[PDB]
Amino acid sequence: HESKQSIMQRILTVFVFTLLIATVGLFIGQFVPVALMLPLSILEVAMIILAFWMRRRKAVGYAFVYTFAFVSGITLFPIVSHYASIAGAYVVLEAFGSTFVIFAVLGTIGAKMKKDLSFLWSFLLVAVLALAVVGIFNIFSPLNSAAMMAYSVIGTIVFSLYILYDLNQIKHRHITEDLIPVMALSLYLDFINLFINLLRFFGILSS
């Protein structure tokens, strides 16, 4: 018989694992010739679209989640290398670092606070759409540095709030073992999409 503690710990474990796997993929992305990479904006919004799309009640397997972690890790290298070529490799750490701590804070706060935050859902969903919208817009009408930067601040706020909300709901809601893969998947999607926004923010800022 599973407890909320065991399910908590398990989702976190799977999550951390997706981080490691995606990291490996990120290492694999550097050995891909530049003639086979996807456009920056396309990937940047792809991550958002996936961040939203994979927020359903359809229980996928650990296989799908880990597979996705690997391939997304691979495909997020062109983003990393870009904001590294314009702002020094150090920023790649910086953003990551920041991301980590944020996830570690709200993720702890929501998972311990007694206020049920269900009422947020709709808004959050809406928020993502807007970002996605702008993202799509960014494909057909590239935004300047300042607008992209404000977009990055917005994205940061949204995905941080989404981290807090997600942990809060993992504790508050009825989550069974079959839901463990899909939960740690979203947790992975928040981390990645927050990191992107921070890397885009500080990467542009230090140019």
What are the domain boundaries of the chain? 1-207
This PDB structure is determined at a resolution in Å of 3.4
Q: Residue 88: left (phi > 0), alpha (psi -120 to 50), or beta?
A: left
Torsion angle, CA of 42/65/127/57, rounded to 10 degrees?
140
Which secondary structure element, helix H or strand E, spans residue 105, and what is its range?
helix 90-110
Q: What was the experiment behind these coordinates?
A: X-ray
What is d(CA 69, CA 48) in angstroms, rounded to the nearest whole number? 14
HSE, side-chain direction, 13 A CA sphere, residue 24: 11
Q: Which two tokens stand for residue 196?
A: 């992107």
**Three-state SS at 79:** helix
Within 10 angstroms of residue 111's Cβ, the number of other Cβ atoms is 18
Residue 103 CA to its chain's centroid (Å): 10
Question: Using alpha carbons only, how large is the chain's radius of gyration in Å?
Answer: 17
* Closest of 63, 54, 79, 206 to residue 145, by C-alpha: 206
